[PDB]
Amino acid sequence: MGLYRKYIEYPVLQKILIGLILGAIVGLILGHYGYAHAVHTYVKPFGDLFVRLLCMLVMPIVFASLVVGAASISPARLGRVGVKIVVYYLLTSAFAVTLGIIMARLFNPGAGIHLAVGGQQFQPHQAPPLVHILLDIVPTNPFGALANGQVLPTIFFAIILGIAITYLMNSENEKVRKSAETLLDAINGLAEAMYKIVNGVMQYAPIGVFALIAYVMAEQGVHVVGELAKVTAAVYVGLTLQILLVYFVLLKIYGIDPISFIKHAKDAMLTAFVTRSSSGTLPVTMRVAKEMGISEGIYSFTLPLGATINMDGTALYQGVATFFIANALGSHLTVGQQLTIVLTAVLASIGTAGVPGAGAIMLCMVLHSVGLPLTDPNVAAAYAMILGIDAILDMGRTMVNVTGDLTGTAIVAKTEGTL
Amino acid sequence: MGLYRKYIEYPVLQKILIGLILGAIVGLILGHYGYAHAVHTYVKPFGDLFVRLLCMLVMPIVFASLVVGAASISPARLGRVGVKIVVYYLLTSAFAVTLGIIMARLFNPGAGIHLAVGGQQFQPHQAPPLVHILLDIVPTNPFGALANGQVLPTIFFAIILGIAITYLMNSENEKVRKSAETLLDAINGLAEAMYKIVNGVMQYAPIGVFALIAYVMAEQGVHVVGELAKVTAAVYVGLTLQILLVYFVLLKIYGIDPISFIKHAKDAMLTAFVTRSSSGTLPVTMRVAKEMGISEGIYSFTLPLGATINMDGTALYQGVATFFIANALGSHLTVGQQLTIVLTAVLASIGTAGVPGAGAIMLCMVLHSVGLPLTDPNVAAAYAMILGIDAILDMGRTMVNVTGDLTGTAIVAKTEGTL
Amino acid sequence: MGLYRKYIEYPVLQKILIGLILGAIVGLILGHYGYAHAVHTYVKPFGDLFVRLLCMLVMPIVFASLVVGAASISPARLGRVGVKIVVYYLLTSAFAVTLGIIMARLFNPGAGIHLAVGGQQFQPHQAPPLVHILLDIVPTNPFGALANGQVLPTIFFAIILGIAITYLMNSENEKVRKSAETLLDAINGLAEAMYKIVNGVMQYAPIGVFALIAYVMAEQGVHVVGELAKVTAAVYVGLTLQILLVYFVLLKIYGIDPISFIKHAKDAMLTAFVTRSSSGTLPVTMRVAKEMGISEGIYSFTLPLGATINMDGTALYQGVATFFIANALGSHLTVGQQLTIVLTAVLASIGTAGVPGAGAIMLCMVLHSVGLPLTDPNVAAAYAMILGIDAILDMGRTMVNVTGDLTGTAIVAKTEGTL
């Protein structure tokens, strides 16, 4: 048990990258020599276990993180600064997923990965009428929506349960207040326990990434490298345009100098790049906000709220990844299930943890809400090749996630300081 | 967002009544001119959303309110006064639902509303033998009974869980006692959060009542007014006979003067009529009980327990409404599923909240336990016309609910004061 | 209600034994005279209710007791003594279920009870491949695994949830620590409430044992006495060999004298025999460990942990009972579903309560994890005759359960005292 401690205390990012490179080389070598069935028999279950462990964690996170998230965005406890930062956060997340859809429309990520995983194509499901679609957001049974997949009734019930808990917590009864407090504390404990299971699965993640993309290279060939490079280029160009366009325009409007802002926020942005965590970058972010002249009463509230709510990079990555997974199956996302991406990726970026590798878990919610279930072997085959390169996108994802919080704190402090 | 605050702070009862009258006039006018399909296309989803929001709240209330209700009726914490008021409360609720069945037998509410909502009638389900019916009260899986509809296993598991929690809370172990305390507090927090969601849905309720009974008048015609007047007459004659017969006989037996009792309890009865809430009428009820000479050690315990347990008017309304919904489909309730109404409406009146509009939610439990599921379009069509006039019956419902508590406090204080 | 208090305060073991003897005599007498259908109509539902009440309690116990059990075996809070006693406990439970399989292989319990309960035999289910079997331990939805039967995903999710809770409880955040504390306290409250429901069902248990084995004797005949005597002999010879072989060899290795150990532990072993409870024998066990010279810092930690984790007799009884139930249906347990017994009976002995009659509830988990569901009428008929004689096996079961704790405390104190 010495080698186990040698394996655990190694850096996780350098473990996943040398799992990825070794998986690519071993998969291409074994696929050139005709051993594409040996990898499917022996190596592929170790990646199937990784995909299964990531898909286990979806529904408790979607319930509990959205309960404790709507408990902080609730209008019963939201002041005057809080309404401004909530409006900023939701509008920037919606523009992030819109820019991700645009950048996944300019590039064509996945067109060329025509998937016939059992000899069959992917048949899209027929949609109900819009009245029945809007009426099935309200469940007839919330326990039945939790026991089945049904993420869209679960989101609605979680949001209204959190808002009702916050309306309970400022009651005039002591028993009612204590009961609402311990219910919210139990749901928050479940939400933190699932994040610990995410942190535990991300230690197994190098072997899973190896076993996934070795089979991807041996089965699907060599052009998947050139097709995943298009996804990486689309995500990084989308994040660069997100930062430049959105944050530089919103800082030039409110009189902030963006160049000095970036030169002040560099120490938080590089830490969010190399650590891939917004929760571990929060002391550096608060120190950077202290060094920018922002008063303590602003960034002592806007930054810990923004570390779990405002994730622009996760919403952009989920838009680009949903378009990639839909293009790999040959489907064409119609208008109407393309606005569902805009709503559901904002809700997923709210529900995302803030630990390394948590956006690929909430991508399953956006895939389920459109009509691409991961029980289908074609969707589960297209999800593996976007799960394999998640550690490359997670760094820029977390960097833009932290930069959005710093931009919102600067803008709202500039608006508040006029008095 | 000024008009939203104009809409919210308006009185809710005067909102629902002017939604109801406008819905009746607009539905009759648009149904006379042949526009019965335009209302079904455009107005009816706004009432379907209201029925769906009320049917969402059934199973968490049925679980949690019955857990925290059986935690207060439990024989591990019930003293000598408590056994007497529990016996009084259960016997008066059983006589209330029996009198509701009698008053819905004398009048014929719903005979004339022959429903053919899809060209088909309502086919009653074939019952199993009585041994299997009694054996399916105990579930093989309580989570499976919660995930499906299955209200009768859920009631049994909730009652025995509350009794086991109360037997845990007087243990000799500190850890066991603290764990039982926080489990009961979390379940009570869920039970209060669902009541807050009820209070939130009852603000949308004017638009829902409008959209429901406009389609009811346009589709089914003009004689539905004369058929709902029979239901209103049956409910109010049943409540008058409940008060007069049951409470005046039980007060004449125990030496109380009923005329002076009514003249003392008028200030609580009128408040329960106009506010439609037993929880908001509790300070007035305790003040009225203080003005009747009742000692503090009696009404400080019997009245807050009676505000959530003893609901005679809700049980009578649920009996009359179940007979109306069964008569509207053409079915005839056999003996055996007519005693199931007597048991299940008592359990529903225990599980009812005490907020305005909470008996129509627990009517779904009595409808499910008989064999009338609300997934059937005929039952969902017959439930809408009894949901539309709920604010007319809720006032007398709450009045009799408060009068039963005051009668029980007077009777048990008269029995205790002989020592 | 005087006769109810006469019935309750009677000793439960002497109630179950005189229910058993009367059931055997009445069943044989009524089966000799051809009245085997009258007992099936009138007496058999009172035993079906007992089996249903015991099968209700399976899934909440399997979830909550394993969460709070893995929260105590967790490596985040396990010291140096704790690793040694955990290794001892798990290895002794595995050897206990292995010895139970051996003793149920030497004897042939159930061969001669060929069951054709509806004219049909028992058809064994076809197993999936080993990769899919190992991959279905991780659920795609934990709420879906709880709502269905699915005990093997529930065990995995419960264990990792408990380990994540213990990794949360030593965090640096106050809110996270308090939330993990109240979540673990709520789950522990549920786990204690289900044990109170077990203690309540075991008061009805004499009538259930009567109604079960009266129908067993009237239906299946007189040779079932000779076939249950083989199960009793196999269990008691297995427990004697468990004590003698395992504990006397493990005490002779570490320099302890086993004869003086038994002469010191007699006062705890007889109390565990006659009371059938490891939780009620814990003060006597700690007093016996104090009288053996063991230091307070060892037995103040190893014995309350061993009272809920180390159950060798329950694992041996579950191995012998699973082989008996498989032999009664005519099936032959293959290798692979015979190692599943070794894993699952260890997990069931961890999850067992420590109250009288709790191993027959967790036997359902071992039956479900092999491929013998209790919804099948043949398995439900073979489970009743092993449920009828549970009070005979429970005494020696609890005796070996307490003796294992005392042996582990002595061995680990001898290992620690060398410093």
Ligand SMILES: CCCCCCCC/C=C/CCCCCCCC(=O)O[C@H](COC(=O)CCCCCCCCCCCCCCC)COP(=O)(O)OCCN
């Ligand atoms: C070749 C092997 C292939 C088969 C291996 C199958 C492994 C199945 C995977 C199971 C993942 C389940 C994760 C458990 C979740 C609960 C644990 C947990 O929450 O604690 C977490 C503990 O994390 C873990 O270490 C869990 C272990 C995950 C698997 C690690 C081993 C990989 C597989 C074995 C290969 C290496 C073995 C040694 C060989 C060199 C918290 O960790 P943290 O981020 O460092 O936080 C610091 C604490 N203050």
Ligand SMILES: CCCCCCCC/C=C/CCCCCCCC(=O)O[C@H](COC(=O)CCCCCCCCCCCCCCC)COP(=O)(O)OCCN
């Ligand atoms: C024409 C519009 C048709 C489409 C409208 C669809 C609306 C969908 C309905 C959603 C109902 C969901 C209710 C959320 C439950 C959680 C909220 C909650 O618990 O707090 C409750 C807040 O209640 C609410 O206001 C929730 C809002 C419900 C809908 C109100 C608006 C009706 C629809 C819009 C029409 C009016 C808009 C303005 C036009 C004049 C507590 O309220 P309280 O009783 O006053 O307690 C006092 C606090 N101390």
Ligand SMILES: CCCCCCCC/C=C/CCCCCCCC(=O)O[C@H](COC(=O)CCCCCCCCCCCCCCC)COP(=O)(O)OCCN
């Ligand atoms: C001939 C009768 C056949 C039909 C009878 C059907 C009975 C259905 C069985 C229901 C069992 C449900 C158990 C409720 C679980 C919750 C109660 C609970 O947790 O408290 C437990 C209370 O236990 C009970 O007494 C529950 C009653 C169980 C049934 C007892 C009556 C047997 C059936 C009636 C026959 C005897 C009636 C009188 C005739 C002589 C704790 O008891 P403890 O072990 O003494 O602990 C001491 C407290 N510090």
Ligand SMILES: N[C@@H](CC(=O)O)C(=O)O
């Ligand atoms: N790693 C990201 C979350 C994600 O997108 O998965 C963050 O901490 O911000």
Ligand SMILES: N[C@@H](CC(=O)O)C(=O)O
């Ligand atoms: N409004 C009633 C409850 C109901 O019958 O819905 C009360 O408070 O008493």
Ligand SMILES: N[C@@H](CC(=O)O)C(=O)O
């Ligand atoms: N009665 C046993 C548990 C069991 O095997 O059922 C004990 O307390 O140890």
Ligand SMILES: [Hg+2]
């Ligand atoms: Hg996933």
Ligand SMILES: [Hg+2]
């Ligand atoms: Hg309803």
Ligand SMILES: [Hg+2]
């Ligand atoms: Hg059982």
Ligand code: NA
């Ligand atoms: Na944003």
Ligand code: NA
């Ligand atoms: Na987030």
Ligand code: NA
């Ligand atoms: Na952020």
Ligand code: NA
């Ligand atoms: Na009553």
Ligand code: NA
């Ligand atoms: Na009530």
Ligand code: NA
């Ligand atoms: Na009342």
Ligand code: NA
């Ligand atoms: Na053991």
